[PDB]
Amino acid sequence: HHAADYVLYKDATKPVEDRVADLLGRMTLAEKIGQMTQIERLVATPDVLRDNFIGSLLSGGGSVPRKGATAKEWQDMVDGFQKACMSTRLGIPMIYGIDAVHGQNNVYGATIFPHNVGLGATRDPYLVKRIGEATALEVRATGIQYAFAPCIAVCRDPRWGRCYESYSEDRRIVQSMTELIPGLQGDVPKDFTSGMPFVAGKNKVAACAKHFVGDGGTVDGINENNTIINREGLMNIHMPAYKNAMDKGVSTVMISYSSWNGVKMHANQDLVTGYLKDTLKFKGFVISDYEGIDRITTPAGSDYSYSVKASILAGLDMIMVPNKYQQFISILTGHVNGGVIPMSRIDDAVTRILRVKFTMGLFENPYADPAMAEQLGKQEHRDLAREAARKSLVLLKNGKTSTDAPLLPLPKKAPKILVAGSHADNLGYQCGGWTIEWQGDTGRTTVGTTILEAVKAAVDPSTVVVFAENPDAEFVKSGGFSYAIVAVGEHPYTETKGDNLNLTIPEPGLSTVQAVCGGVRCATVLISGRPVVVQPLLAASDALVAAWLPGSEGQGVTDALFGDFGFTGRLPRTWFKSVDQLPMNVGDAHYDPLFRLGYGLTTNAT
Numbered sequence: 001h002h003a004a005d006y007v008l009y010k011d012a013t014k015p016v017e018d019r020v021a022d023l024l025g026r027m028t029l030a031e032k033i034g035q036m037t038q039i040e041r042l043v044a045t046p047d048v049l050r051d052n053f054i055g056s057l058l059s060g061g062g063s064v065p066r067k068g069a070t071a072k073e074w075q076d077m078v079d080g081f082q083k084a085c086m087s088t089r090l091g092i093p094m095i096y097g098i099d100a101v102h103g104q105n106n107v108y109g110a111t112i113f114p115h116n117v118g119l120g121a122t123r124d125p126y127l128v129k130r131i132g133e134a135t136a137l138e139v140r141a142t143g144i145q146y147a148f149a150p151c152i153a154v155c156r157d158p159r160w161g162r163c164y165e166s167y168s169e170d171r172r173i174v175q176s177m178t179e180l181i182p183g184l185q186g187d188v189p190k191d192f193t194s195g196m197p198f199v200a201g202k203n204k205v206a207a208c209a210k211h212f213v214g215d216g217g218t219v220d221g222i223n224e225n226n227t228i229i230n231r232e233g234l235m236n237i238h239m240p241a242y243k244n245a246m247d248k249g250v251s252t253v254m255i256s257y258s259s260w261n262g263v264k265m266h267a268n269q270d271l272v273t274g275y276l277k278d279t280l281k282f283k284g285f286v287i288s289d290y291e292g293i294d295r296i297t298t299p300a301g302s303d304y305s306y307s308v309k310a311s312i313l314a315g316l317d318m319i320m321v322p323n324k325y326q327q328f329i330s331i332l333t334g335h336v337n338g339g340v341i342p343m344s345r346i347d348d349a350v351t352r353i354l355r356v357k358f359t360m361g362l363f364e365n366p367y368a369d370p371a372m373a374e375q376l377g378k379q380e381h382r383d384l385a386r387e388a389a390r391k392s393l394v395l396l397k398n399g400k401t402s403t404d405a406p407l408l409p410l411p412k413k414a415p416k417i418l419v420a421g422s423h424a425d426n427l428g429y430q431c432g433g434w435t436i437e438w439q440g441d442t443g444r445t446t447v448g449t450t451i452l453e454a455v456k457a458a459v460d461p462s463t464v465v466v467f468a469e470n471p472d473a474e475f476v477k478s479g480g481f482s483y484a485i486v487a488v489g490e491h492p493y494t495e496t497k498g499d500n501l502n503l504t505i506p507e508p509g510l511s512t513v514q515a516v517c518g519g520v521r522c523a524t525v526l527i528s529g530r531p532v533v534v535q536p537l538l539a540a541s542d543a544l545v546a547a548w549l550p551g552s553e554g555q556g557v558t559d560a561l562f563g564d565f566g567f568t569g570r571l572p573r574t575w576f577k578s579v580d581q582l583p584m585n586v587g588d589a590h591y592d593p594l595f596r597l598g599y600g601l602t603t604n605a606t
C-alpha cells in the first residue's frame, strides 16, 4: 500500500474508525489491558510503561516532578514517559491526565482562575469558555493532553467539601457552564453527532465530565456517600448537564465514588452502560475515579478481584488504578482468560480509548511543543482571570441603613487606609483547594497578587496603605484611617476535610471584622468556597462582598472595590440563615433563605 511497510493505523490521512479497528485487530490481550490501565507518575518508570503497555498516566493532586518546576521540566517529564510508550511494539502513545480545574493548578506559575462556584456567580458562559481555552493552553505548556474537568456536580448541600467545584445548586446554571468543554477541546464541527468525543488538535486538551452521577446530592453533603433520590430527581437535577456535555463532544466521563440509592456508581451497569453509553450514545471513554473500584467493597480494597469484575462489567473503560497496576493487570488478565469478562467488553473499552487518542491527534503529536511553554501564566490569561474574579464577586451589603452613603465604590485617593484580616495578604487562602497541593496551602505558593498587593497597585500614590493582619480596636481608632478593607474567611480544603457541619469561619475572622468596623467604615471581603454563617459579619460591616475563591489575580477584587467596574455577580447558591435548615435549595417547599439564589447588589463604575 506504498512504502511496503505500510500500517494503516499509523496513516494520519485515514478515518479514525478505520485506524481504531486496524490497531485493535493487531493487539495482544496484554496490549489491550495495558490501554485500559492508568497509573500515577509516582509509580511509573520506562520499564513499567513499556513492559505493561500502559495506556495512560496521571498526576493526582500535588503529584509534581518537583516544587517550583518550570513548564519545560513538566514537558521533559511527560516526554520521557511518552518515549517509553512509543518504544513498545505498536507504539501507542500514552495520554497524560491532570486536575486542571481552575487553571493548570498543580503547576507553579500557572494562572489560577476562580473556582466554579464563583464562575456560576458570573452567569457568563462565554467567559467560562474563554477560561477553558486559556486553561488548555496552560495545560499544553506543560506537555499534558488531558484535563479532569469540568466537574458538573450540582451541589445540593453546601456542607459538602467540594461544593466550590460546583457552578451552582441550579442545574440550569451548571448546564450553561458546560461551555468550558468546547473551550478546553475546541468547538465541534457543524455536522457533529452528540456523544462522539472531540478534540481539535495539539493546542487543545481532552476534557472529562465528572463525577457521574449525583456527586452533588450526597446525604448531609458527605463526600463519597449515598445520593438518595428517585430516578426523577436524578434525571431532573443531576443528569441534564451530562447531556449538554454529550452535545459538546466531551471526550471522557469519570465515574463518582458515590452511590445512587445504595448502588455504587463504579458497579452500576444500568447507568454506565444502559444510560450513559446506550441511551446518551456516549462514544468516548469512561474512566474510574482514583481507586474508585477499590471502594466498591467495604472495607475498600478487601476484594480487588470483585472490584475489577464489577467495574469492567458495569462498563468502565479505563481504570485509574493508580498505584497497584501489577495486581490490576494480573487480575483482569485472569478474568478474561477464565471467561468471566468477555473479549467483547475488553475490545469495547480499548476501542473507546483509542478513538479518543486518534481523534485528538495524539498519534500525530505525541510529544510536547516547547514553543508552548510560555503560555504558562501568560499575562493575557491573568487578565482573563482578573476579569473572571471581578465578575464573580457578589455584593451582599453596601450601607448599614437605607439612608447611608454607599461605601462602595471606595475612592483611590485618601490620606490613609487600612487593609486587614487573615485573608488580605495570603495567596494560598484566596486560591483555596486544588492549588499547588491537593488541599491547597497557606502563603505565597505560586505567582499572583494578594488583596493587599492589589490595593497598593490601585490607589493614588498619595494614599498611605497600612497593613495589619489582626489589629485591635484601639489601633484602628487611633490610626486616622479613611476606611478599611478587611478580608477573612475559610482556609483551603477539599472533599472530606471540607465536609463541615457548622460552616462558621475560623477565628480570628469575625473578631477582626468587629474590631476594624467598630473603628472605621469597612468593606468586608469574605473568601469562601460556599455560603457560611454570615449574619454576624453582616451586622458589623458597612459593606460585604462574597468573593468566593477568586484565584491568583486579586486585582479582580479591587477592580470592583474601587469602582473601575460595577458589581454584577449574582448568588449561584442559596444563602442559608442557619445550617439547621440544610439542605435547602431554590424551589424547595420550605424555602426561607437569608439571600435567595440570584441575589446580588450592584454598583456603577466611577
Ligand SMILES: CO[C@@H]1O[C@H](CS[C@@H]2O[C@H](CO)[C@@H](O)[C@H](O)[C@H]2O)[C@@H](O)[C@H](O)[C@H]1O
Pocket: 059, 060, 061, 063, 099, 148, 210, 289, 290, 438
Ligand atoms: C487522598 O488521596 C488524594 O486524593 C485526591 C482526590 S481523589 C480523586 O482524584 C482524581 C484524580 O486526581 C480527581 O480527578 C477526582 O476529582 C478525585 O475525586 C487525588 O487527586 C490525589 O492523587 C490523592 O493522593
